[PDB]
């Protein structure tokens, strides 16, 4: 009875993005503690990625809160385990994160393009306010990270950028 | 000479939104002082609804300011007296407020699709920023109030929800 | 059961002073946003008349609270739109205001004359305490405002009084 | 040689009201301690009525002070013991106080109407300033209380209103 | 243009009350500096009566401010010289001020009766608010002083009551 | 490798908008120091336009930061010198600025239209969030200034508005 | 009638320098945002050159202020777009700024030598006070930077100097 201008296809897209943000959260947590293994031992990457895990779990909860505000119903799925068990050099993990965030961006845009076709002006603006520029700034951050990490090279530079920059 | 991309039909629609926001305001004032009558005596509801009345008046001034900013012209109408002189129990009045808020939301969504068809980016963003999400938030709040007022039940519970939740 | 020494003619009297007060709130809010128009651009009168709109809206609620205190029943009517869509010069606006407040004042005294003619000591003293002198002091204020606005003249003077004295 | 415009009849009516304000005081102190009885044990009503009894003693001292200000002589009578020795439910006692304060308001308006017929402008205003509006608000407060006492009902609702609202 | 419900006779009354208030002021100033004289030399009464002069001139200015407010025209007259050049003992001086406030009080009550007959309810409340109760309190204070000046008697007692009570 | 859903015409439009806010920033610099001339010497207009010149500079910079954030390339052109070398009366300059801002507002709305047509949801919300409402507020502000500057006229009115309002 | 000892030729040379200080400003702002590009991502150089560009804009405003102080008229020219659209390595951009500031120092000494030949003692001193020593220190700072950029080398040394020393 609060539901208004809230399409069922939009409702299911919210449900798939919820799962999607949880999966991003689970993947970053895996990166965080891959950097906590003694054989890797990059503490700033671990701090940085652990908070990336917290933020994406906050994205999933925004989507959940929004599903309820609009009169939708929350339907949770399995959160697939991450696609790798270890994540390589630092630059490899950051490159993995960029690819993850671009796929997350693309789904948000698909979700956006979808509420638009259902005439859902509020849902469109809600997604712009909370996700579309944040995703854009997140992807620029990572692009910068990858360029700098190429600059300072393997070895002493990877340590330096992990300490003086990530966290 | 300050008018720029402001359609004659968009302006007329702001003028009717001004009236509707003033109608909401006057209805909530009726609700506020109904709950201050000795045969009802619910000080939470009165506080709560007096605030609501104040806010619907602020929305009406926003729109007037918005008309003036975009080069339009405020044209005022009578403010129709509210559909009821008394509003029953606490839950009933809450339900009337949900009914009115959904009606105000549909007028806003209509006004949004209108400016969109005249291709008025600034106006659609304006409605989104100041209104469309506040309507969703308020419609969710009213939904929760009707649900809890059902859980608390008549008698002691109506008083408790009124005292400890509303104002 | 709380009603005592409260004639049904007076209960009707308060109800219609309520409407009259709300009408003045709306007249003034029209004035305040007429002065917000680019073609007019008098920020001081905008502030001043906006304030005056809230103060008569508070007047209306005193009466509503009173009606309730004595054991009456509020019955709201429509709030008729203002006499005028636009308000001329600043002096023109202030002079219509003085007219409004003398009409209002007159009906307060016709409402007083009749709580008196029914032996309602407390109504008369409540009207005196909250209304008769506040009206007097306002009408004097507005008369001073008309005399000064004549004094400083159109154009630069109108500006200066608006800026330096109204808000 | 301080007496001026002070009717002999107004003076005796002040003396009877003095007795009536004390009568109220003693009735309230019998309520306040009935609710301190273990068979009743409502500490919130006890607090509440004890205060009321101080209030009504204070009123009595206002009238005595006034009789001295206007050149009259205070003549004291027995303070009749209250009408009951126990006062039933909390709602029973509140309705009973509404009746007392109803009688007192009638006695005060009749006093007002007496001094008005004797041309005593200062007396009329004094009664208006110290008593008549605060009797109206007292009757408003007690009516409201009764309505909320009927709403919360007997048992858990009586306890709650005792503890939360009275005292 | 501001004048409303303000009779020509009352306006003449406000003018005579103004002259009386100024006359009052000028008699207390005389008393004040009579006590400043070496042959009298009562400094507490000099302080006291000087404040009574300052306060009676404030009364004169309120009435003028009331005249301007109601749309009257202030018409001023000679301020007659007080009735005595010297005022005997401290008790005599108070007895003359008791005589003087009672004349003022009678004139204030004549003034009330007379706006009342013209149905000027604001003017009746105004005289009640600012003057009527104040006259009563001052006559009681003056009578109180007079009884005490009898009790302390002549000599050392007049000295003591001047220093320790007046100022 | 960060570029995503960013069209290549949009990227061109961001560069020409960059050139357009620098052209404005430079026009406002010209105006600011024209009023600093002894033959003109309006210090308030100096401050005011100097600050507008900084704000349009920052507009240019936000647009370059967005080009970078979105994965495009900044290409700059000559900053065309302002269209006049002197700016007439104060009211003339504020008219030139309204023209200038309405032209900016047109290209921003052409850039919004244009990204919309490519489906660039984030760019649209970016222009609404930083530019479209800011434009509308500046235009209203400017039109009010012209209306007031008209009212106060030339001579003392121009000096006064310069000093008390602009800067 | 303020102009004194101010040669026509000195005046035009001030105007050309104004253009040259702005030219520097726009060249630096193109550096500052090239280093904000993801392919470069040197936030320390971005901070650094953005500041330099504000500095050089400020210089421009000094010259405009001076041309007004000495009775001349400011004549604005196009601001030519910088020489490159991207600026290579961090050391490449610093050497390039050293060359710019070298040209500017030459243009400023030639301006100095011009006013000296025209007997303009105040102008010579002004250029000495606001520009010539702070060009020398600017050339000193940039030389030092280049030497430390050649010392830390490309890769890890570039990152470090960016982060630690510039910004």
Author numbering:
A (entry chain H), B (entry chain E), C (entry chain F), D (entry chain D), E (entry chain A), F (entry chain C), ...: 3 to 169
Authors' own words:
Ferritin is the main iron storage protein in most living organisms, playing a key role in iron homeostasis and detoxification. Canonical ferritin is composed of 24 subunits, which self-assemble into a quasi-spherical nanocage with an outer diameter of ~12 nm and an interior diameter of ~8 nm. Ferritin has prominent octahedral 4-3-2 symmetry, and each ferritin molecule contains 24 C3–C4 interfaces, 12 C2 interfaces, 8 C3 interfaces, and 6 C4 interfaces, which provide several potential pathways for metal ions and small organic molecules to diffuse into its inner cavity. Thereafter, we introduced a self-assembling strategy by designing π–π stacking interactions at the shared protein interfaces involved in two different kinds of 3D protein nanocage superlattices, which is referred to as key protein interface redesign (KPIR).
Subsequently, Pro156 was replaced with His, termed P156HAfFer. To elucidate the detailed structure of the 3D protein arrays, the high-quality cubic crystals of P156HAfFer were obtained, and subsequently, its crystal structure was solved at a resolution of 2.50 Å. The space group is I23, with unit-cell parameters of a = b = c = 229.16 Å and α = β = γ, indicating that the SC lattice was yielded by P156HAfFer. As expected, the introduced histidine residues formed two pairs of π–π interactions between two neighboring P156HAfFer molecules. Additionally, two pairs of electrostatic attractions were formed by Lys93 and Asp94’ between adjacent ferritin molecules. Although such electrostatic attraction is also involved in the formation of the SC superlattices, the designed His-involved π–π interactions play a dominant role because wild-type AfFer cannot assemble into such SC superlattices. Although the adjacent P156HAfFer cages are not aligned along the C4 rotation axes perfectly, the dislocation angles and distances are almost negligible relative to the entire cage-like structure of ferritin, and thus, they do not affect the overall SC structure. Additionally, in their SC crystals, the C4 rotation axes of adjacent P156HAfFer cages are not aligned perfectly, while the P156FAfFer molecules are perfectly aligned.
